[PDB]
């Protein structure tokens, strides 16, 4: 509808943390529309025009030795400081998931069906969900969704298993996540 051209400016400061805060790298970056023009990377020590628009800025800002020193100290004054202000409620956050196994189309035996192992509501996103055919591991036919970042500090994932259900069988969805010592497992029995 509104046909008027837009112009957008974005400034991002990124504190990248390695091995806790053992290695920290601040990368500040200016992005014109969707084009990053200049940035300051702590590993370099100064501004560097990323594209020809930023050259004036990189050259100017690097002239101001005041700026260059504050930024250089930013990995301690800003980065390490904020990691420390937020540590207990962000870095140290753990919400356990609830696992649920259900076949995709509730219909009869000896026929192709996907068993679904729904893993939801956890944080951090590091998880391991495995399928077992009568105690044995299934690496074939697992249609997994990847990890889904829900936006509310929670993740979810759906890992399917293509099965030709034959009764007497038991399929188990095993989930390993930082918030549990022993894995959660949800078992399913091939309709007798």
């Amino acid at each position: 509808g509104d046909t008027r051209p837009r112009f957008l400016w974005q400034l991002k400061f990124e504190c990248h943390f390695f091995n806790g805060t053992e290695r920290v790298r601040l990368l500040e970056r200016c992005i014109y529309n969707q084009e990053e023009s200049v940035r300051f990377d702590s590993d370099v020590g100064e501004y560097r025009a990323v594209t020809e628009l930023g050259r004036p800025d990189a050259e100017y800002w690097n002239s101001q030795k005041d700026l260059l020193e504050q930024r250089r100290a930013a990995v301690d004054t800003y980065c390490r400081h904020n990691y420390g202000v937020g540590e207990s409620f962000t870095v140290q956050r753990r919400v356990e998931p609830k696992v649920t196994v259900y076949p995709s189309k509730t219909q009869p035996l000896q026929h192709h069906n996907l068993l679904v192992c729904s893993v939801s509501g956890f944080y951090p996103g590091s998880i391991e969900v495995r399928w077992f055919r009568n105690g044995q591991e299934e690496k074939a036919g697992v249609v997994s969704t990847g990890l889904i970042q829900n936006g509310d500090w929670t993740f979810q994932t759906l890992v399917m298993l293509e099965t030709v259900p034959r009764s007497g069988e038991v399929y188990t969805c095993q989930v390993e996540h930082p918030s549990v010592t022993s894995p959660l497992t949800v078992e399913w029995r091939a309709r007798s």
Binding site: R6, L8, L11
Partner: protein
């Protein structure tokens, strides 16, 4: 070196809209953002506010600079405008749905720019505003934005829903449907 976490203070300013945003991001999730009108820090999860504070008026000092620089960049780029890039919309629920058990529908709007989009939850065609929650535009490595909207609902075989998104990069509104199957 393999990384462990990333905290990003992201902020933007957009002309002609004259919109601005200041916000913190930890691993893809927003910690807080500063309501530019109410000049107040709003934490994604209240609990956060029990562990930390932020001086919300500083964010405004920043947006003032960002706007100044937009004016300067716009002029030096000889008014090169932003290329709309339409959003990928996906609607999914919070957890598996069980009839007549509360749940939440999430409309994830992704890979778009500029950061201006209209979203509406339609239940059986009618807009729903009760319980609707939404996030602010989250930043992307590709310099585009990301956004989510939520609609707490009660599963039944009776209703159908849609998430209608409007963006200047799309040639007509986009409805991503959801109904119990």
């Amino acid at each position: 070196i393999k990384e462990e976490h990333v905290i990003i203070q992201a902020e933007f300013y957009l002309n002609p809209d004259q919109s601005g945003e200041f916000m913190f991001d930890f691993d893809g999730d927003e910690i807080f953002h500063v309501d530019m009108a109410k000049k107040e820090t709003v934490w994604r999860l209240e609990e956060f506010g029990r562990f930390a504070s932020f001086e919300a008026q500083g964010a405004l000092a920043n947006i003032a600079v960002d706007k100044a620089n937009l004016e300067i960049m716009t002029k030096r780029s000889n008014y090169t405008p932003i290329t709309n890039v339409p959003p990928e919309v996906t609607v999914l629920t919070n957890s598996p749905v069980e009839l007549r058990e509360p749940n939440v529908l999430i409309c994830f709007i992704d890979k778009f720019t500029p950061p201006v989009v209209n979203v509406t939850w339609l239940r059986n065609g009618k807009p729903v505003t009760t319980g609707v929650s939404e996030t602010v535009f989250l930043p992307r490595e590709d310099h585009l934005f990301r956004k989510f909207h939520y609609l707490p609902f009660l599963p039944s075989t009776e209703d159908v829903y849609d998430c209608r998104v409007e963006h200047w990069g799309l040639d007509e509104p986009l409805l991503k449907h959801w109904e119990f199957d």
